[PDB]
């Protein structure tokens, strides 16, 4: 039978309706004290649940006295609920759950070896949470767990490659908003937010997987394909009035890593899927939300410049009206500039001129002209006006040296 994320005979999953501890298994736990704890963890009341974890976290602190409590039965059961606690909408629950597991790995080093394939992927997923207040404490705990040995952590991304990729597949492909959140106790909005947060983590975890591994594309190609072919990751490229741009930026990073590692030239279909969704995205950037999108504008421009290098700007052909789409994006983006912005524009210019994407005098020059005009009116009110202005003139002066050629 398919055990999902499990490797010790029981099913581990992120959804709410399977992968739960067997009542007869729970009743085999060493102590009645553990049974009450697990009984409260399986309840919804956040208060009693938060208290259950606290009790559990303390039992593990005084591990020497309660070593027999944390036997194979305990680990089996825990491995199943842990996967569910780390998607709790209360970060308190998520923090403690990650802490407990990391503690067990430390207090049980060689006696927990069977379960590393079931714990390490979820531990690392915790370190990949966009919320720094969750990911950083998890990383400090994990780091300490291996005595601050850097190579000992880097080894994890290699050793547990397959399981990590399986966890991503689980999140992106096998699960969705409605299986991750129970509609009985969650509104559509909370479910959207819950999935958003989890899949965002999975993208960052996927990024780190590419960074730490050169031969990631070769070993698990088939699985990488079903992950990157799904519509779930690329859905994070949708701006929303309530959401911030952290997930958006994460996807931009993914596209960048996939291209630099040469995965994109090897999979033209995933290329066209990412570029198309990225171009659709630009059209949703308007004056209404420009202040919100402001901090990613340089990243967008920098990404488009990198992708333009691919076979003399072939990506633009994936949509005949892309030249027009870039035009409306540049015209809007210059109404909310920031450090790095004009640097990235020049990057875009420098690359795209190699096939004369946009007219030098009719489209490029008016852009630079209207930019400085706004800068002079707004500034020098706030920062980083000074930096931004200097950056503009530096890039514009380089742009201006090609005027002779036309």
Residues forming the site for K ion (CB under 5 A): 176, 232
At closest approach, how far in Å is the CB of 134 from K ion?
Answer: 22
Whichever of 60 and 233 has its CB closer to K ion, that residue is 233
Whichever of 201 and 351 has its CB closer to K ion, that residue is 201
> What is the separation, in whole angstroms, between the first and last Cα of the chain?
69
> CA angle at residue 146 from 82 to 105, to 5 degrees?
30
Whichever of 169 and 334 has its CB closer to K ion, that residue is 169
Whichever of 232 and 314 has its CB closer to K ion, that residue is 232
At closest approach, how far in Å is the CB of 235 from K ion?
Answer: 8
At closest approach, how far in Å is the CB of 79 from K ion?
Answer: 23
Whichever of 66 and 232 has its CB closer to K ion, that residue is 232
At closest approach, how far in Å is the CB of 46 from K ion?
Answer: 26
Please answer whether residues 256 and 301 qualify as being in contact, where contact means their C-beta atoms are separated by less than 8 angstroms. no
At closest approach, how far in Å is the CB of 195 from K ion?
Answer: 7
Please answer whether residues 92 and 50 qualify as being in contact, where contact means their C-beta atoms are separated by less than 8 angstroms. yes
CA dist 154 and 157 (Å) reads: 6
Other C-beta atoms within 10 Å of 286: how many?
Answer: 12
Whichever of 236 and 279 has its CB closer to K ion, that residue is 236
Whichever of 41 and 198 has its CB closer to K ion, that residue is 198
Please answer whether residues 81 and 21 qualify as being in contact, where contact means their C-beta atoms are separated by less than 8 angstroms. yes
CA dist 192 and 51 (Å) reads: 27
Return the residue matching tokens 């524009």.
345
At closest approach, how far in Å is the CB of 41 from K ion?
Answer: 26
Q: Which residues contact 10 (CB under 8 A, 6 or more apart)?
A: 3, 19, 21, 22, 25, 76, 79, 80
CA nearest 69: which of 106, 95, 107?
Answer: 107
Other C-beta atoms within 10 Å of 59: how many?
Answer: 18
Burial of 327 (0-12, 13-18, 19+ CB in 10 A): middle
At closest approach, how far in Å is the CB of 270 from K ion?
Answer: 16
Q: Which residues contact 232 (CB under 8 A, 6 or more apart)?
A: 172, 173, 176, 199
At closest approach, how far in Å is the CB of 231 from K ion?
Answer: 8
Residues of the chain with a following break (C to N over 2.5 Å):
none
Q: Closest-CB residue for K ion?
A: 232
Sign of CA dihedral 102, 104, 107, 109: negative
At closest approach, how far in Å is the CB of 77 from K ion?
Answer: 27
Whichever of 215 and 231 has its CB closer to K ion, that residue is 231
Whichever of 179 and 299 has its CB closer to K ion, that residue is 179
């Amino acid at each position: 039978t398919d055990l999902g994320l499990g490797h010790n005979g029981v099913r581990i999953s992120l959804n709410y309706f399977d992968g739960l501890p067997d009542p007869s298994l729970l009743n085999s736990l060493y102590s009645n004290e553990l049974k009450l704890i697990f009984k409260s963890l399986l309840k919804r009341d956040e208060t009693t649940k938060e208290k259950a974890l606290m009790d559990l976290s303390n039992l593990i602190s005084d591990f020497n006295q309660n070593e027999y409590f944390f036997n194979d039965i305990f680990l089996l059961c825990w491995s199943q609920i842990y996967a569910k606690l780390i998607i709790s909408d209360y970060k308190v629950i998520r923090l403690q759950s990650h802490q407990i597991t990391i503690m067990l790995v430390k207090s049980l080093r060689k006696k927990i070896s069977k379960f590393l394939k079931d714990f390490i992927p979820l531990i690392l997923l915790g370190t990949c949470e966009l919320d720094y207040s969750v990911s950083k404490p998890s990383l400090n705990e994990l780091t300490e767990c291996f005595n601050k040995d850097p190579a000992k952590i880097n080894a994890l991304w290699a050793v547990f490659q397959e399981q990590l990729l399986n966890l991503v597949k689980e999140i992106v492909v096998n699960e969705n908003e409605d299986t991750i959140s129970d509609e009985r106790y969650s509104s559509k909005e909370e479910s959207e937010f819950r999935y958003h947060r989890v899949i965002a983590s999975a993208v960052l975890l996927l990024i780190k997987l590419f960074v730490h591994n050169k031969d990631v594309s070769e070993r698990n190609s088939s699985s990488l394909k079903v992950i990157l072919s799904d519509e779930s990751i690329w859905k994070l490229l949708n701006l929303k009035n309530g959401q911030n741009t952290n997930a958006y930026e994460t996807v931009l990073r993914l596209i960048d890593v996939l291209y630099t590692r040469g995965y994109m030239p090897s999979h033209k279909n995933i290329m066209k899927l990412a570029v198309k969704k990225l171009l659709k995205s630009l059209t949703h950037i308007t004056s209404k939300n420009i202040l919100k999108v402001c901090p990613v504008l340089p990243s967008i421009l920098n990404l488009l410049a990198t992708l333009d290098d691919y076979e003399d700007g072939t990506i633009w052909s994936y949509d005949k009206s892309s030249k027009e789409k870039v035009l409306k994006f540049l015209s809007v983006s210059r109404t909310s500039p920031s450090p790095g912005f004009f640097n990235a524009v020049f990057a875009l210019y420098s690359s795209t001129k190699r096939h004369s994407f946009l007219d030098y005098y009719l489209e490029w020059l008016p852009f630079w002209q209207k930019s400085v005009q706004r800068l002079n009116e707004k500034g020098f009110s706030a920062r980083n006006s000074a930096e931004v202005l200097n950056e503009f003139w530096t890039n514009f002066l380089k742009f201006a040296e090609d005027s002779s050629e036309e």
